[PDB]
Each structure stands twice: as structure tokens, then as C-alpha cells.
Design a protein around this ligand. Structure first.
Ligand code: YFN
Ligand code: ZN
Length: 140
């Protein structure tokens, strides 16, 4: 579990979004595993605006943050997980690291801020849904 809190927006994995998220919906995309909802309080996170390929991510199933290199946002085939079938996911970055389903929502960050959130795992990789292209998160 986990979210990004930027401005008055809450960015979550679409598959973990709550009824309140859907009732306060700003934007969602199944192919990306992302959903954004509106918040009453302003949030503490800054979104990275960059093409970094190195950062640090939080792994809840290890209680640890790991430094990783990751691929640029890509259309990737993802094998079946507990929460999605085998399918293509877009805007997905991969690193070598540990990820189980409950790790979804952990932040990946670089020197510029939050890059994305854990969205995939298995076979010794961790996949992250990118948010750095969502420039509208920074305003309004
Ligand atoms: C921009 C992008 N396109 C590609 O690179 C080739 C066409 C597949 C689609 C969105 S993405 O997945 O972020 C990567
Ligand atoms: Zn960066």
C-alpha cells in the first residue's frame, strides 16, 4: 500500500483505489495502474520532472529502501499477479529488486522528487508506474 500526496491530489495504484477515491476521482488509467483523487489537506510530496534512471524505492515486504537503476517508461508485458491478469502495462519502469503485491504504492524517488510508485513484481524485478509525465499534478 501507499500513495503520493502532491498538492490536493492523492496518487494511488488503480487496483488499490478506495470507494472514496472513485467518488472524488480526478483521473484514472487501467493500462498504467494509476488513479488520482482529490484531497482536503495539501500533501508533502514533490514530483520529479526529469529522465533519471537511478533512484531509491521503498519495499514494505523488507521494511527497507533500496537504491536501484530502472528502465525509462515503457509498454511492458507483465505476468499474472494476485491483482491483475497477464497483460501489457504502459508507462512502466523495471528494476532488479524485490516486489510482492502488498509492496504496491511504495515510492521510487530520485534527486528531483517522486518518480513513481511500485506497481508490479515477481521474477526478481520491481516495476514502477511513472508519474513524471503527469505535469498537471503540479498545479490546480
Ligand atoms: C511513449 C511510449 N511508447 C513507446 O515507447 C513505444 C510505442 C510503444 C508509450 C507510453 S510508454 O509506455 O510510456 C512508452
Ligand atoms: Zn530525477
Amino acid at each position: 500500500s501507499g500513495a503520493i500526496y502532491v498538492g490536493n491530489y492523492r496518487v494511488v495504484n488503480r487496483h488499490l483505489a478506495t470507494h472514496n477515491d472513485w467518488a472524488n476521482l480526478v483521473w484514472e488509467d487501467s493500462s498504467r495502474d494509476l488513479l488520482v483523487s482529490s484531497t482536503t489537506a495539501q500533501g508533502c510530496d514533490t514530483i520529479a520532472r526529469c529522465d533519471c534512471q537511478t533512484g531509491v524505492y521503498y519495499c514494505s515486504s523488507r521494511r527497507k529502501h533500496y537504491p536501484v537503476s530502472f528502465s525509462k517508461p515503457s509498454l511492458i508485458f507483465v505476468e499474472a499477479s494476485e491483482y491483475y491478469p497477464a497483460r501489457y502495462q504502459s508507462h512502466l519502469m523495471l528494476a532488479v529488486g524485490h516486489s510482492e503485491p502488498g509492496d504496491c504504492g511504495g515510492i521510487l524517488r530520485c534527486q528531483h522528487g517522486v518518480v513513481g510508485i511500485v506497481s508490479t513484481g515477481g521474477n526478481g524485478l520491481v516495476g514502477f508506474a511513472d508519474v513524471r509525465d503527469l505535469l498537471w499534478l503540479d498545479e490546480e
